[PDB]
Design a binder for these strands. Structure first.
Ligand SMILES: [Zn+2]
Ligand SMILES: [Zn+2]
Lengths: 80, 84, 94, 109, 92, 98, 147, 79, 97, 94, 110
DNA sequence: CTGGAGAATCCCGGTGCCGAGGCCGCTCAATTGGTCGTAGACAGCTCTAGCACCGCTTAAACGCACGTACGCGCTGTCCCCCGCGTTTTAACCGCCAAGGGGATTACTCCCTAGTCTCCAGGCACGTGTCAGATATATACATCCTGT
DNA sequence: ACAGGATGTATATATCTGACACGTGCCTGGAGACTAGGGAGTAATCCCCTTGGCGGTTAAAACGCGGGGGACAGCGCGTACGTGCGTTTAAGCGGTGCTAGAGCTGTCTACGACCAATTGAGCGGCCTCGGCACCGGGATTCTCCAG
């Protein structure tokens, strides 16, 4: 499983930014947005997998995901 | 011409597999744990951080032992030239 | 067949008591349960620190209201203290 | 033959469970003992908070001509009332979205 | 017989095991996850000439100081192979 | 004669369109593929729940929309309306992610 | 530490001399070295040998030495003072660099001048706009400067 | 009152200099002291509500440390 | 007579203050400030010297952090002069408003 | 005349073991003690939670190691877990 | 008459008090029971942390030509070490000061 | 600055559905009734430390001139980003199939809480001496205006 | 770019001094030995859900082309703020004095943990219909180009 970081399409990034309400977007934004979104992923799943493996199970629950979000000060509602 | 055999013997003693105790198969040391076993020794043991040390594999990328592979192949040539 | 706990019945009762003719979604019910939980651990953890700082070993209404005053900002704290004190007084009256 | 079982929630005139909160506190590893009035006070505080949240959500939902409260109404109510916005400024709501605002510079003139 | 290329291969080993940054025989290995080899104290002068994150000496960037580990796989072999080479010089 | 709006009016209308609803904006299959590729660097053959990947999503677009909200104000403070890569790095340094 | 590092650098090159280029101390001062470099094969400098001096820093190899041509060379990145603009000599300096290797980098720069970062802007115009007569300018200079 | 003016203009200037600031406009001092006082009633309101809960009439340094701890501004050097 | 152009005394005093550790706020006016900020919640409080020093240290650390962030904003805005727009921008980005 | 506990003696032994010719100021010693207390509180809180969520009741080495792994950044965690594990192993061996 | 009492800290070759850590764990309202190896592991982790901090502070103080550690050395060490900085980026040190750094545009043209 | 054209947007009505809402076990988690050991409230003594005040110093704060360098408004440009038609691709939905791993219960036993006894390692309190603060005299690096 | 004058600025020696490192006495918290009890670790079993694949639809994505708005470099101007100097003021230190409130010990009783017996409240499961999501069509409105 390789080469899907470009799977975050340009229109998807534009739509995300426009949900935040930006008018005009430069062409040099997409790569570092990929990078920061990346960094957020290895910041969350790194803790999530540790949570799972501590319980000695190989399936990652939504409970552990929201657990990792909570421990980073960005708690999530809607999953328990 | 006589100490050569002792030298070679010490060589495999310091390089051979400790699990297999024969010719190595792309062995890789995960790090601080002293594992000289072949990669196939741990190819199915991947998990629990280590076969013995139980230290999690922080080096997710394969830290290839290029220098150690070089050393083992030079050991092979010294073996070949020693045993004419 | 395990038995699972939630605050759904109580949240639904409060919703029907406030707005008698308003529905609720399952996702909204889960969000409400998560919210009431998060508030519960916040208040309980703060009360634990208040109890431990004063070298106390019992969590009473004083520590809980102190924690409520710490966390609830301004107006909600003023309302929450009043409603909680009313409930405690009525409970002691029975 | 002892007496009719009366819930401590009915004793304090509340809908939130009091014995359940007491059990959670005593198994929550906060102290080896818990005062009697602490769960009663906490249940009232939780009931008031959820009542405020639900009434704001219901007002927002009836504004949107709907009878069921969805996470969009909850997000709108929380981010519209600044007090709850300050209380819950570090939590995101699933399918909550964002509130429609545009900076005045972006608007054409 | 075949002695000359024996010493050529000996030079090959000693080149592969020489301090790439320092040209000093590494008495006991000190390796990073980049698997580079130091003869000690090269890293400390590296961290003295600048007050920031370290840069990989031979490779590009794989070190931030004290990320090394006490690799002892060649520590025993250094003096060993030295004993064989000196004895073999004496032997022949 | 083909009809074309001036650049910006459709931008504002699609600002309004996406600031009123809550549909997921990132495509689910490539998102979960990327998430699985991220996870495979830690443990092999891990299994994911649909709820877990959905929660990771919900976190993902929330963080991105917050970052874009910050960088938009950063750009307008820069006396311009087009966001630039320097703006988001300034936003991420001010908040304390670097 | 700097002095000993110099000793092994000259020692191995003594047993393994470079094919064309050469260098060595000009006295007891190990910090000052002179080198003779010949023009790269099939290049405008072919046939000429350029002379340059090396100034080791006090903390060598931790800092790049001060090296400039004593022989004038026509180059978009080299001035009449012999000063050389080389990337490995300024920012990606690394103790792992050795005199033998860096000299080959000079040869490559002789075969591949970098007009993008010129030290003499006019010569950079000569190289990019018409490489052909730039060779003609470079080669005649070698006869009068490098020979 | 008037104690908010006690933070004199050179004090703000030298705080900015420690912050790495090159120059200060005239419209900065009345905003820095406003931010300062807002922070002060953000912290003191927690310190005093700790003290009153402790049945104390004085403000201890430990209560201040606890008040900073809850606001993500933990302090080292006071226990 | 000698006259330093504007820009060097500022740099030298930045250098002087960036290695200093003493408190840049005078003790007495700050104590008078905190004693009147705290009097609107409860009457006639008492304060320890350690407590007032902790308040001074914490507020000065918060202010120097806010100033370095708003200076970052000032360079980003292609300026070198601090203006309250940068203060407000830093305050809002850090989530304090 | 009340007896209060601090970590100053142990911090001093560690200093005299690492740099045998260095001293500590009183303010610096207090800062070090406060730092050690803060780290102890973080680790203990994380381990207690990790025990709580999995319906566990015992604070063992595994979940405190996990808490260290989540809280300590990068190879700080890698060195800390190894040094804790060797200490526990040698404690158990005797 | 039973045996010579050996401290658990000396059993594991540690200077931090294992018994004190165990008492704090059992009286810290964390769980109703605590394992035996938990305090041993915790003491080793804390010892590693304080040892790294102390050696960095000593290096800084010797660079400042002092034999006593003041909060300035601790501040400089933890803020210069990149990872210790993020671990302790949210803490404030009394009498610690800030780090010497000047923005590129602010220094003169030269 | 004032009107048509178009395009998106808004508003209204008919239709099917599945998720919100409601009802029936029932089981366990809530209640009620005694009992006991104890932690917190309460009283009393105290003395450390916080508050208040008076006098001498002077560093720092404050006020005013100045002139210069930076904030800021107006102008030209070109190029980089946006609106839109077109072709392609993979998301997306629906269905099906195998199974691995998550989710229970039994049962044992081995680890850990609790208790009593004993003592020494760590804490309270003197205690002198050397690292560090300060003064003063330098040598020395760097700005700044004139050339 | 260079140079001398001037303003800081790093360095060394001498001298005081109080904070620290050590030493000593003492006690309570840690250690050793013992006991009992339940937390959970392992084994066995069941099945919900993850994974994988296949096939049809089409909506979103890639690509491109024109073209215009704005990011940017430049310039000029004007006010505003750094730099300096003269004139205060109150911080700072010290020294003294007073006493309120923190901190400790000793009682004593309400009160919450704990256990046993009971029962009903909320949850799992299982229906059931209307709020709504959708489709379709008609009315409303805002931008844009031309006038
Ligand atoms: Zn093997
Ligand atoms: Zn070396």
């Amino acid at each position: 499983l390789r080469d899907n970081i470009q799977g975050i399409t340009k229109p998807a990034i534009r739509r995300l930014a426009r949900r935040g309400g930006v008018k005009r977007i430069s062409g040099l934004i997409y790569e570092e947005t990929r990078g920061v979104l990346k960094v957020f992923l290895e910041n969350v799943i790194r803790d999530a997998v540790t949570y799972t493996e501590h319980a000695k199970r190989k399936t990652v629950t939504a409970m552990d995901v929201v657990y990792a979000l909570k421990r980073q000060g960005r708690t999530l509602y809607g999953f328990g | 011409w006589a100490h050569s055999r002792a030298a070679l013997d010490r060589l495999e003693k310091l390089l051979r597999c400790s699990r297999c105790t024969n010719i190595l198969r792309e062995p890789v040391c995960l790090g601080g744990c002293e594992h000289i076993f072949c990669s196939n020794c741990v190819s199915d043991c991947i998990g629990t951080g280590c076969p013995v040390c139980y230290t999690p594999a922080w080096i997710q990328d394969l830290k290839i032992n290029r220098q150690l592979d070089s050393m083992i192949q030079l050991c092979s040539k010294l073996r070949n030239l020693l045993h004419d | 067949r395990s038995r699972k706990e939630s605050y759904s019945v109580y949240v639904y009762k409060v919703l029907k008591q406030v707005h008698p003719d308003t529905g609720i979604s399952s996702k909204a019910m889960g969000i409400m349960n998560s919210f009431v939980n998060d508030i519960f651990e916040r208040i309980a953890g703060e009360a634990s620190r208040l109890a431990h700082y004063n070298k106390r070993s019992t969590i009473t209404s004083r520590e809980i209201q102190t924690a409520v005053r710490l966390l609830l900002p301004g107006e909600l704290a003023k309302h929450a203290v009043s409603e909680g004190t009313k409930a405690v007084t009525k409970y002691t009256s029975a | 033959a002892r007496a009719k079982a009366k819930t401590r929630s009915s004793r304090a005139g509340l809908q939130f469970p009091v014995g359940r909160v007491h059990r959670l506190l005593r198994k929550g590893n906060y102290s080896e003992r818990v005062g009697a009035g602490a769960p009663v006070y906490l249940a009232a505080v939780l009931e008031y908070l959820t009542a405020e949240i639900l009434e704001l959500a219901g007002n927002a939902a009836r504004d949107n001509k709907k009878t069921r409260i969805i996470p969009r109404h909850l997000q709108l109510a929380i981010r519209n009332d600044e007090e709850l916005n300050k209380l819950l400024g570090r939590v995101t709501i699933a399918q909550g979205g964002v509130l429609p605002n545009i900076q005045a510079v972006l608007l054409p003139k | 017989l075949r002695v000359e290329e024996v010493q050529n291969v000996i030079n090959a080993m000693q080149k592969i095991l020489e301090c790439p940054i320092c040209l000093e025989l590494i008495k006991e290995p000190v390796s990073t996850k980049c698997d580079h080899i130091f003869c000690k104290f090269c890293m400390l002068k590296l961290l003295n000439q600048k007050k920031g994150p370290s840069q990989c000496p031979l490779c590009k960037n794989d070190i931030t100081k004290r990320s090394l580990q006490e690799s002892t796989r060649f520590s025993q072999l250094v003096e060993e192979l030295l004993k064989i080479i000196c004895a073999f010089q004496l032997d022949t | 004669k083909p009809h074309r709006y001036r650049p910006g009016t459709v931008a504002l209308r699609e600002i309004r369109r996406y600031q009123k609803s809550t549909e997921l904006l990132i495509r689910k299959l490539p998102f979960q593929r990327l998430v699985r590729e991220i996870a495979q660097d830690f443990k092999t053959d891990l299994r994911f729940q649909s709820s877990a990947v959905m929660a990771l999503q919900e976190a993902s677009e929330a963080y991105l929309v917050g970052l874009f909200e910050d960088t938009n104000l950063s750009a307008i403070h820069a006396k311009r309306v087009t966001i630039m890569p320097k703006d988001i790095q300034l936003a991420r340094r001010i908040r304390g992610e670097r | 530490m700097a002095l000993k590092r110099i000793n092994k650098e000259l020692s191995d090159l003594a047993r393994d001399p470079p094919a064309q280029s050469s260098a060595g101390p000009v006295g007891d001062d190990m910090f000052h070295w002179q080198a003779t470099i010949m023009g790269p094969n099939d290049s405008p400098y072919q046939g000429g040998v350029f002379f340059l001096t090396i100034h080791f820093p006090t903390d060598y190899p931790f800092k790049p030495p001060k090296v400039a041509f004593t022989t004038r060379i026509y180059h978009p990145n080299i001035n009449s003072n012999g000063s050389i603009c080389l990337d490995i000599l300024r920012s990606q300096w690394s103790p792992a660099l050795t005199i033998s290797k860096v000299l080959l980098s000079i040869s490559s720069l002789l075969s591949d001048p970098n007009p993008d970062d010129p030290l003499v802007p006019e010569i950079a115009r000569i190289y990019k706009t018409d490489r052909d007569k730039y060779n003609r300018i470079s080669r005649e200079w070698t006869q009068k400067y490098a020979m």
